[PDB]
Amino acid sequence: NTGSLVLLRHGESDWNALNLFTGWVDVGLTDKGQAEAVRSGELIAEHDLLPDVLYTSLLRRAITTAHLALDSADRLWIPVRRSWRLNERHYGALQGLDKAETKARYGEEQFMAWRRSYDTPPPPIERGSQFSQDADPRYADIGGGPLTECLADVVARFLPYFTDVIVGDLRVGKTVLIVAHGNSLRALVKHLDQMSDDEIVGLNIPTGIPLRYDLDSAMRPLVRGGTYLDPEAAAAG
Amino acid sequence: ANTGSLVLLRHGESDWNALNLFTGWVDVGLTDKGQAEAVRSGELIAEHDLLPDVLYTSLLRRAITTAHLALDSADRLWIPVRRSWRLNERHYGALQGLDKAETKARYGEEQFMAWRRSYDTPPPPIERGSQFSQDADPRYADIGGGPLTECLADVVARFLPYFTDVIVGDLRVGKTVLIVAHGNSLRALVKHLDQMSDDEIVGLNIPTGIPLRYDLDSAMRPLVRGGTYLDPEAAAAGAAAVA
Amino acid sequence: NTGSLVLLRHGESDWNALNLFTGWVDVGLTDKGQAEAVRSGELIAEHDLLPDVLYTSLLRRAITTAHLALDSADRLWIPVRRSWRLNERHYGALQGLDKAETKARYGEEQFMAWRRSYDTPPPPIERGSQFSQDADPRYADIGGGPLTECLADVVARFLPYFTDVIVGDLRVGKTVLIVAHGNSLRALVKHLDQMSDDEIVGLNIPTGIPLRYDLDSAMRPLVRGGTYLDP
Amino acid sequence: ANTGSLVLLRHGESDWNALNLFTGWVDVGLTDKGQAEAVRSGELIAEHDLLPDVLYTSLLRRAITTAHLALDSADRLWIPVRRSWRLNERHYGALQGLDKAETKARYGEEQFMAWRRSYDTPPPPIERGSQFSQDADPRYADIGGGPLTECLADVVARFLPYFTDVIVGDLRVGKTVLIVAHGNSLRALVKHLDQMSDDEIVGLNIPTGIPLRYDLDSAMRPLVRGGTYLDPEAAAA
């Protein structure tokens, strides 16, 4: 068997609650976000999808979600690997700004572009500014990381991790759990279902509902778009 | 590189500590108070700028969650982690799941203290397949389901290969290593670091919640015999508090 | 402090002897190529630079070079990791061709652009052809791999391996040996010395002579262009 | 077809084998005869459709070079490799660097035989810092220089941890594993797999340069006790 691949997007963070652009800013989960993660773990267990290995980003809202999920699934003991390549998109100079206030100041057109352009990133964040990560030691091996990203950049930096590290696990039949972010999971779905640049821009992935991919020998999905474990909950839009 | 700092951390109160039951490999959770201890452990590591570069744990949720909580308060959640059965608590054999007092009453003082601490005599073997046995748990599949009981000598034998072949090389290249584990496995490590006698380690008590820093030389010999607790006062009192 | 980085480009292959474009074709070293690897090892040992870890490509001419070098340096026992990201540039449909046939097939203008461009790859090789690698199981996790590459493509797929794996070793003080290929090492030098797209394409890297890069905390060369270990 | 195949290979003639010297951890190389054995072993592997997915060796060049030549012939040079002292030949203590005559001279005939086939009695410890001692070799730093002598019981004891915690996991996910090592370390492994007595394993011969195949069940139990050589006709010679 090619192993099952389970994707999970973390739930509500503190900055989600404040309605701020977060990006690589390392904020925590709200109480609700923590409760969602626990249920995530129940769903996984309820559908007989116990992971053999866990992949996360370097961001605590994904790492804690993963912890809580595995705790509820009774699989805390399994191996885990973490990579910046699973991080959320870097939001550049938007990091720390209010979304509502931003939409107003620049309008819906610039807003939507910033949020949803595939090829065009926001302005670069200022090095060593309050909400920049360029001085964080976790990014020293990449020279502090990018100053901004668009989804096309996420795709480019995510995919090497997937092919070089995770695919190997699936190939030998392991069930893989990936806990990460809207943009990095959108990047992976774009690759798995071989989606176009404009098709991927309309893709929404809901929080806290595990998404199961059943792959073939070629790492090709058996079911395009995968299968959510709670379709009606997924279905909130 | 100059040799990395080694940090040892014993988890706090579990649900079975609270019910006074022998635990061993039974995979019980933490009490609210054991969780609070772990958060505090993290603060101490940070206030003493001992930020870890890598984490090692057992396969037991009370250590794993202790680790998560400490790294979160130390803001080092993102570091790599490795887990191994070789860091597990001593297996308590047929004592797993039984009340310590009730067991003391029935078997006697001397037998009770021999089981808990006798360096070379383990408790009686657990029944394969029984309610508090781990022998059929997949996580121990590659070791044939594991031992049915253990003495400290047993823990020392199965713990050290992991220390020398995995953790030491981290220390050698200068990484700050955090090990979050259990009473007997950490006592097994301390026995080895400080080259303690069988007789001496039986008396050693390691307090919960308080990180212990070892400063090692190039040959992995401690520069401070017995290491240094980040809260030496608490340490002395936790060393008492035990059980 | 930061570890030393030692770079080694393998010596003569069987196809170099016939002047054939090789790319990912997995051809072996000539006997001269082998002897050059042995000497490479002697030079490393002669300069007291004993590696703590080895990185190679998936191609036998580098793998064997590394084996012979480490043998002669008496550091055979060290950990080794291999990656397609360290492979030679894929030469697309030129793989297996000599110049003549290539200028014949593709004209002199493209022969030139394909030789000196940074951003123009050769034509894609045909899938399942005799000198294609798309069916090799070693490339299964990347869907068989690319069917052609320009230097820019090599830079793009090389650097993730360098930052995410090799720089970590360097940061904790290890001496790192990389045994690879003209263009993969060219890509690395581009990064280390921050060279321009225009300047990198004709950068020369001699075979069989180790190249030592002393770096600072910031992974920046103390010496621009490194130091060749040689008489 | 889920539990992977195990392929064991004992290197051929070393330069000290030619001088009839006790070698142990002394890191001598392969004779011309020895290399040819290696190359032929690789052809045998390929001829039997046994492509390795991963390679395990000792830290001793006679093994590592054997592995390289074998994989070269099988055209699997590119596969991942892991090396460990736990696959090393038995340490021969004070006998390292001695011939039979000089051994019988300073130690006597009575224990020469003892140290020959006693499961449990190691030769004398070698002098630390002496000419054929490895105690100061940096590759054994993490284990304090290593033991100063071994008996086969010792070898069994330090081998098995590596088998259960590293190699079995590969087998479990279906990989074909190639182990290239030495007489006493492969003996340790076969004693385990076929549950050989202490006294049984003393007279077990493993021929040099003939790959030994073990097919295993989920319990890591051989399907065929003793396994299957790839050149049966040559089993002893």
Swiss-Prot record, chain C:
Residues annotated as site: Transition state stabilizer: 181
Catalytic machinery residues: 10 (tele-phosphohistidine intermediate), 88 (proton donor/acceptor)
Binding-site residues for substrate, renumbered to this chain: 9-16, 22-23, 61, 88-91, 99, 115-116, 182-183
Catalytic activities: (2R)-2-phosphoglycerate = (2R)-3-phosphoglycerate
PROSITE patterns, sorted: PG_MUTASE
Pathway field: Carbohydrate degradation; glycolysis; pyruvate from D-glyceraldehyde 3-phosphate: step 3/5
CDD domains assigned: HP_PGM_like
Keyword Protease: no
Transmembrane segments annotated in the record for this chain: none
Enzyme Commission designation: 5.4.2.11
Superkingdom classification of source: Bacteria
Annotated keywords: Gluconeogenesis, Glycolysis, Isomerase
Family: Belongs to the phosphoglycerate mutase family. BPG-dependent PGAM subfamily.
NCBIfam families reported for this sequence: pgm_1, PRK14115.1, PRK14120.1
Function, in words: Catalyzes the interconversion of 2-phosphoglycerate and 3-phosphoglycerate.
Listed name of the protein: 2,3-bisphosphoglycerate-dependent phosphoglycerate mutase
